[PDB]
Structure 1
């Protein structure tokens, strides 16, 4: 059950900040319907982008510490990290096609 890294506040440094390569971090919560709408889409991307990218999820209620560090203000927010640095930001639900395009464009 791990293609997706399931992050915590304590593991966020190792898992994201010190990863060699691109991580796609999904800031989300259980009550958030758009967050849940995109979850299946993230599963497909995890598979599709395997070897180019890792997908990780931080649940902002269970892990309240990390989101303020990135000025997160609404969910879902997708932050693309490249080797510990944020390259791209996407706020709100989007389709698979839209996510593919956001990824393809920011991964170069």
Structure 2
């Protein structure tokens, strides 16, 4: 069949190291709602072949794994992608509900942001009057730049807590933001490895730079 039958021993390889999304069902033979969703999972596995693999771990025969994920009730579904927990769903649900859960979470977000945030690129010490224009000019290589914010943020309530800089770069359209992230993410500049990634456009539009 299309379903992967997991054990405690095979979990890391079948799930954590898999290519592609894996939907993990934590189940037991005596569990009413587990038996209810079992036919649905078989239908999911067929329909989403090529995009998702459905796997099941029986928690009676394999008691090692679920506690590591804080599983309480069953069934519980976990969607993994490339080793990350993308989403969790506790209890039974309809095939329609499951599909929307999957569709949404396989997409990863509801919208590609025009806003890029650069992390680990400068220290507060490095902020001068030129930096905004430099960022604008460098990022102008990828598309039209709407606005740049050099934002300083204190990481915790303590007096001695660390101050870091986040550099927001809002492009005119999300294709530009995408090119810039692709060119910049994981690049080394003067001794530091930059994280470039999307920043929630709704937060930014609402002056929330905290994320």
User: Do these two structures clear the TM 0.5 threshold for a shared fold by scoring above it?
Assistant: yes
| TM interval, short-chain normalised | over 0.9
Question: Over aligned residues, Cα RMSD in angstroms?
Answer: 2.0
Aligned to 2:194: none
Aligned to 1:20: 19
1:73 CA drift (Å): 0.4
Distance 1:42 1:21 in 2: 17
Distance 1:21 1:30 in 2: 27
Structure 2 residue runs of 5 or longer lacking an equivalent are 106-210
Structure 1 residue runs of 5 or longer lacking an equivalent are none
Distance 2:102 2:16 in 1: 19
Aligned to 2:10: 11
TM-score, normalising length from structure 2? 0.49
* Larger gyration radius, structure 1 or structure 2: 2
TM-score, normalising length from structure 1? 0.96
- The C-alpha deviation readout for 1:43-99, integer Å capped at 9, x for no partner, is 000000000000000000000000000000000000000011100000000000000
SS at match of 1:8: coil
- The C-alpha deviation readout for 1:9-29, integer Å capped at 9, x for no partner, is 000011001001100000000
Distance 1:20 1:38 in 2: 25
SS at match of 2:55: strand
Asked which structure has the greater RCO (Cα within 8 Å, sep 6+), the reply is 1
Aligned residues: 106
Moved over 3 A (4+): none
1:42 CA drift (Å): 0.2
Aligned to 1:46: 45
SS at match of 2:30: coil
Aligned to 2:80: 81
1:41 CA drift (Å): 0.2
Distance 2:76 2:64 in 1: 15
SS at match of 2:44: helix
